[PDB]
């Protein structure tokens, strides 16, 4: 259906033809930028405010346009049909972005304010739509919670107790221009902060050699547990990447995938007396028992259809060919014995 | 309340207190349903939590008292009926599920195909809601 | 047991029901460092005073209390029951923290103590009961102890042989404010410990082309062995977390741990000639060898019970099965044979 | 001091001054133990060291030098029976321990189960503190 | 032939016999660069003008030479034999440089052509010949382009967030020297390019507490966002470095290499009806659906014959000879029961 | 022997008999330095010149003790035993470190020279003995060569270029304190190498907005081509580390071991004619091939022997099992099949 | 057009509207190639795309549709001339061509042989430029 | 100069040029070795590079042309010797290396022990320079 190709074309990338549209505002919208610092700069007055008005009502009346033709456009998926439905889909945290830029560039042509003009590029700098960045990211940061925050905490600790003792030892020393500049504790943390980091702007550095002492044996200590969590979350998403080529392929989910809803169906429909599945008393409880384990088992199947190919699947196949070749070498073997 | 002892000594021919392979077999043979060894094997498995291969009756009820309703399994039907839908927008030819549900996996009855599109299908034409098919189950 | 739940609720917390305690301890002592500083600014001398002293006794008192109430709920292990065995619980380095600032809350009660004031901030600094991060931490510290001794050990080498050439190059060189800033070697090795860590002040720079030539050719192999620590341990801590997610389920260990007290208790009880182990004078002695053989393969197979899968299970596995077909195949063949 | 060759004789019937695993399990059937071939091979290989499959005497001498009592096994010990703690403060209820070494495992008679326990429980009600009763093996 | 012997030298080097004049013709151009150094600090005329053009000469003769016994040379191989296949060759990125070395120095040797000079060096520099450096190095950075997209992305958000808001908080705080540091948000951008690289020149720090305090909170947070790209190709390079050792010898791809050109062209041979490939009407239909399904099989089977060992091949291995066993054995059973 | 006990002492150490007095030669030479220092603050002169002068004999006479007992213990490995063998030894590199030690020492004594007291530290310096650590490094650095290579070569090329535009672009920018810090390329040359590393001094920054664009465009950009070695490195060590902990036993290398010499002597005694091993014309050449092959496949199966474990051995394993019980199958058909 | 089902109804004898692996080894019987069980069964692989382990007729008109001229399958077999190349030139003798032919792999008939070799090496002596032989298939 | 089929002769019984795994089995039956099938297939594979399992000959000069005296062989006689080295200094007794010899691997007649030890020794009592033995070899 063509609403279906055109949220396809909104949303949902697939490539060029969407890219240049996402150019063309792109480039758009800095040259908007571009020309207010002219307007700032007061070029000719008559240029300066009459285009940037008209360009100004052409950027929000577009950007109002293609709000709402996506809003009408987002009725393809299931989810979303219907008026009560759409309000969810109005909720998503992402479209609200679009409205509050949509409101204040209408508050803007309407009239910090200056600043507020710069608000608007929220919209061009949010560029991802599927949201499929953050949703990667959020994974990788999630699983490695514990290590990022047990070196989050021994930095912290690290950096409050090194950045007392050169507070202490640093107390009363003058400058050459004549100015303390170790004269509180809020220096000393500022000091620290700067230092472990590996930033260093130089603006307060120890001068007595105590604090030279400390701060050299902290700085060594202390760098590589605030370099951590970039090596942690690299090596996070390097290893993904090797799991990401040894995929199984398509080919060898559809059964499981429909045993799990044939099952999940039989299971159901062993609730009604009168329903067609008793086709196939007291066995009427005995059926749904074997159905409950047939489909646990087709659960379990099903969840371990979709993994990366692991040697716990070797070794459950070698036992279970294992069964199935003794069970026959022993029934030739009675079959034999007979005579 | 535990009424389902009742069923447990269906189960337990020997009477010796557990359930073995060989009596879900033999039980399993009265209703014509003719299972393998390894299928058998793989069945027992998933109620047996003492790791000695044979199910014990306060597994049983373990099991038996399990919920079907929770949302850890909604998702898994509901991933299971996605992979099937060609865009992702949440229809399905009806045509494209009766055959799927007659050919593959393990074949269905056609008057069970009936029956379940008959409870479906009342939005229209053969476009059929999973997801709202799935809160039925 | 009501004193089993205290102590999971003290200590081994659950989540948000502690964690709301916690919470507030939190803040309110933050508003006591606020506040301190407060009365340090010399404000309305009646409040600054008189609420200071109540919320100061408050929070002693409090922090008394729950000292003694943990100490008391501490008998609910077997390790720590007894008047006698207490005292093992209370020599825990965790617990001294608390005594120390107990004590040291109640001495500024009474009376650089400045910065006494600061030392209760150890309590909530440390927050975590279990020690799980530090014991997380010390393994993968530990394993990697080798690699990480010979880079830093290569780094050390590298900055006192590259800090004295510099000295030498720049003994007798002037700035533009007149003053040497190369004047003797401990100057040197500070800029040479300020440079190798990549923070660069600026206070002392190279000023003599020689300088500089032996400057840029150290700092570019040297800043290498000093950031090899962090990507060690992070690479660490990432090949942990795949082999976190990939072991063996709880019911693989319960047969082997059965087993392995089993036999253990076979083998004590064997010392014994009157023990009803005898119903299972030269056959009393084989008996021995025969548990003591027993004993050790279990507790072998326990060892291994409890480990991720590995490939070498695989190859034993094969060998193991290939070994039981085969002797029925040739039991199969002799038994043809007889005709 | 070296009485133990007297019960290595035993094991080498044939006399060459080495044990096989066909010798094990001959020896091993006079006492009714029916082994299997697998667990003749398993036991077997724990002593060898020369990797020849064979078990030589001075390795029989070190198997048999080997002290029980050691921290290693100790904490091994410690370790299994941790597994079984429902709540890891270091207390068993008796009935579970009896219903737990006369089912799993190996199974042992009733009045092994029944010596051991005497020897523990002395302390109260059916709460056995397993970290005083490893000591005493 | 002699021609590929020269083509193996001058391109496709194997050592030290093209490393000795790769290493003459490196020094010797740096000597030219430091004689031209040397004439313009205007040394003894004479000399400094006549050996330098001397000198010059004597390269840029060499360069053409050499450019065109390789165009020549490069003959060797069938896709640049011809006069219309060589534009091809010539076409190469790789020698455009050069060419354009060769046209810059006659030009040079006729007359910033100051800067000119410096621009021969584009040939030295550019000494790996086959490609192999910059053909490894894009296969890492093609497979990971998603991971290193969204950290680019996220860094580039915070950096603009964060450096408009310390510009609204330093708005108008001015310095000791009397001079608005942060008077412009140009400023304020440069300042957190300079900040969120860990570089620090010091030339702008923030003054006001506000700007200190959002400063400290989003540099500790963001310096990792540009710290990542690192550790995930250096993780890349190592996992790949791993790959590398655990490949199939050459051995094995020899038969499955063999019958695909076999079947390959079997499958065109069939297209003609007198060929003697029908040697071995409507037997001649089906003969072309076995023949390309034997093709599409020799195709999988080489794509799979030159990869690195993969448990797949583990659990297609056993299937397949379960099968093969099985077949034999339900063989046997029948062959048995028939008394 | 006791002269076994001696070496084992002085070289490959064991643990803390020898740390104790590596302990005491550390700090008493450290102890030497510290009084050198002060005899040059010039204190109580009849002490710092006659204590200084003993202790300095104490110590080049135990060193050169310490080097004449180890030059003799040397002789229990064979590979040093004999006059002429142990020149050797002598040549090792590590021993000369402390002959020039121990003639520097001798020199000052007899006596920039104030730097040769320095000089000495040399030994204490180098205090790993069995060279475990730069054995450990260097195949690390060398199995990763290529990778290394072509990221500091990039780093070069982008550093070079980047360097000469910003020169261009800053030529005749003047600073506030008038002084032309851009004013030749050498100059931008040292700002590319002090900004390429994140070091950043600030004694050189870029003025115009051409320059600050082109700084900004490319740090960006460089600064992980020279962040990635450490990267590399890391994640090999980290990588080899799971690898060590993966190693067959030492009880699978004994047969091949032995397997091996015994066929390589066979071998070799099948040159002689006379020799027993012909006990087991034509037949005395076939021989010689079968045991040829016999050594070849010994050979491969001890190179094979002490490799960790890989699933070629389970592809092999499987294959072979196969065989072993395909050919039984058949022998019983065949039986079988006689009646 | 869709004339291919001609063919079909051939390897279709029991007409159920599906080809089995019995079907395909009982009719490439009649042509005397004698095949091996395995072999059957990779080669139904290659066309299957239900997991059935069975060919639909859909999927043999989609295997018949698949075009050999593309990039994919020119690259696969300009990389296997190019693993029999000694020096990588882009050339061949054609003697090596010959006994590779004839001997390794699945053997071709002589007659095969000097039929292809004429199509080939009408540029001069014994060197076959492979990458255009490429292009001629 | 290439003598060495005249050899090949006596391994080539049927004469088709190549050496199958049969032919050396049944030329080894006559010298009574009994070798074991994955034993013969193992020692195949040493010497073919074709792949296709079967000795060319070519590849039968190939591997006749081979040097023994090289770094690369040297390195491992030694290394497996110091495997067997209780402390790395070079020496080994003369008891255990016949014990070694004479028990583990595949076991050497006395008099070959005997003959290898008196090359052997010749330094003094019963150390053994195992680096001036290998250079023998």
Redesign the interface.
């Given at each position: 259906n063509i609403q279906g190709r055109v949220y396809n074309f909104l949303e949902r990338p697939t490539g060029w033809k969407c890219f240049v549209y996402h150019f063309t505002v792109f480039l758009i919208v800095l040259i908007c930028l571009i020309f207010s610092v002219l307007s700032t700069i007061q070029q000719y007055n008559n240029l300066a405010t009459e285009t940037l008005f008209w360009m100004r009502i052409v950027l929000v009346v577009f950007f109002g346009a293609e709000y709402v033709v996506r809003l009408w456009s987002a009725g393809c998926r299931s989810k979303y049909v219907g008026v009560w439905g759409r309000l969810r889909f109005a909720r998503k945290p992402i479209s609200v972005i679009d409205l509050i830029v949509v409101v204040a560039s209408v508050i803007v042509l309407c009239v910090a304010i200056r600043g507020i003009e710069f608000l608007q590029i929220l919209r061009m700098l949010h560029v991802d739509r599927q949201g499929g960045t953050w949703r990667l990211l959020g994974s990788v940061v999630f699983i490695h919670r514990q290590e990022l925050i047990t070196t989050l905490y021994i930095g912290f600790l690290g950096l409050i107790f090194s950045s007392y003792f050169v507070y202490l030892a640093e107390k009363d020393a003058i400058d050459s221009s004549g100015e303390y500049q170790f004269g509180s504790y809020a220096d000393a943390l500022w000091w620290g902060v700067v230092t472990v980091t590996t930033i260093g702007y130089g603006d307060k550095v120890p001068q007595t050699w105590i604090g030279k002492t400390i701060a050299s044996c902290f700085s060594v200590f202390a760098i590589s547990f605030f370099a951590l969590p970039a090596g942690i979350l690299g090596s996070g998403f390097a290893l993904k990447v090797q799991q990401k080529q040894r995929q199984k392929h398509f080919n060898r989910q559809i059964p499981a995938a429909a045993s799990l809803i044939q099952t999940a169906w039989r299971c159901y429909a062993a609730e009604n007396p009168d329903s067609a599945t008793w086709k196939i008393e007291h066995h009427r409880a005995a059926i749904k028992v074997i159905r409950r384990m047939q489909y646990f088992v087709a659960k379990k199947k099903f969840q371990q259809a979709r993994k990366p190919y692991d040697v716990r699947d070797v070794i459950e196949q070698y036992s279970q060919g294992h069964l199935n070749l003794m069970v026959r070498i022993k029934e030739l073997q009675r079959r034999l014995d007979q005579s | 309340i535990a009424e389902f002892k009742?069923?447990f000594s269906?189960?337990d021919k020997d009477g010796d207190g557990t359930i073995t392979t060989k009596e879900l077999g033999t039980?399993?043979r009265?209703?014509?349903?003719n299972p393998t060894?390894?299928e058998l094997?793989?069945?027992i498995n998933?109620?047996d939590?003492?790791?000695?291969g044979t199910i014990d009756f306060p597994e049983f009820l373990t099991?038996?008292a399990r919920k079907?309703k929770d949302t850890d399994?909604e998702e898994?039907?509901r991933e299971?009926?996605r992979?099937?839908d060609k865009?992702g927008?949440?229809?399905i030819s009806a045509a494209e599920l009766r055959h799927?549900?007659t050919?593959?996996?393990?074949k269905?009855?056609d008057?069970?195909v009936?029956?379940?599109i008959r409870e479906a299908d009342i939005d229209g034409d053969g476009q059929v809601?999973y997801?709202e098919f799935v809160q039925?189950?």
């Amino acid at each position: 259906n063509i609403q279906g190709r055109v949220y396809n074309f909104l949303e949902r990338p697939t490539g060029w033809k969407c890219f240049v549209y996402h150019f063309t505002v792109f480039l758009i919208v800095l040259i908007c930028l571009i020309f207010s610092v002219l307007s700032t700069i007061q070029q000719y007055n008559n240029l300066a405010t009459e285009t940037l008005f008209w360009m100004r009502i052409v950027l929000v009346v577009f950007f109002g346009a293609e709000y709402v033709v996506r809003l009408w456009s987002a009725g393809c998926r299931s989810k979303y049909v219907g008026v009560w439905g759409r309000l969810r889909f109005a909720r998503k945290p992402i479209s609200v972005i679009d409205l509050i830029v949509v409101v204040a560039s209408v508050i803007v042509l309407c009239v910090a304010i200056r600043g507020i003009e710069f608000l608007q590029i929220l919209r061009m700098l949010h560029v991802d739509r599927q949201g499929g960045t953050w949703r990667l990211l959020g994974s990788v940061v999630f699983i490695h919670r514990q290590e990022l925050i047990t070196t989050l905490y021994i930095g912290f600790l690290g950096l409050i107790f090194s950045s007392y003792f050169v507070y202490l030892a640093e107390k009363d020393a003058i400058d050459s221009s004549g100015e303390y500049q170790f004269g509180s504790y809020a220096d000393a943390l500022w000091w620290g902060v700067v230092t472990v980091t590996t930033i260093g702007y130089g603006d307060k550095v120890p001068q007595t050699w105590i604090g030279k002492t400390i701060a050299s044996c902290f700085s060594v200590f202390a760098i590589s547990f605030f370099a951590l969590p970039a090596g942690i979350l690299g090596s996070g998403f390097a290893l993904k990447v090797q799991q990401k080529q040894r995929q199984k392929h398509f080919n060898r989910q559809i059964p499981a995938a429909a045993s799990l809803i044939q099952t999940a169906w039989r299971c159901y429909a062993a609730e009604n007396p009168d329903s067609a599945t008793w086709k196939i008393e007291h066995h009427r409880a005995a059926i749904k028992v074997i159905r409950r384990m047939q489909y646990f088992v087709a659960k379990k199947k099903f969840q371990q259809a979709r993994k990366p190919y692991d040697v716990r699947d070797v070794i459950e196949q070698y036992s279970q060919g294992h069964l199935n070749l003794m069970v026959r070498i022993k029934e030739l073997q009675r079959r034999l014995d007979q005579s | 309340i535990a009424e389902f002892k009742e069923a447990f000594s269906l189960f337990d021919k020997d009477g010796d207190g557990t359930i073995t392979t060989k009596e879900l077999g033999t039980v399993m043979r009265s209703l014509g349903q003719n299972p393998t060894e390894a299928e058998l094997q793989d069945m027992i498995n998933e109620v047996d939590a003492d790791g000695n291969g044979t199910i014990d009756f306060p597994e049983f009820l373990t099991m038996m008292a399990r919920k079907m309703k929770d949302t850890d399994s909604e998702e898994e039907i509901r991933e299971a009926f996605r992979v099937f839908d060609k865009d992702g927008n949440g229809y399905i030819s009806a045509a494209e599920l009766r055959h799927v549900m007659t050919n593959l996996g393990e074949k269905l009855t056609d008057e069970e195909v009936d029956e379940m599109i008959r409870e479906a299908d009342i939005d229209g034409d053969g476009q059929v809601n999973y997801e709202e098919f799935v809160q039925m189950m």
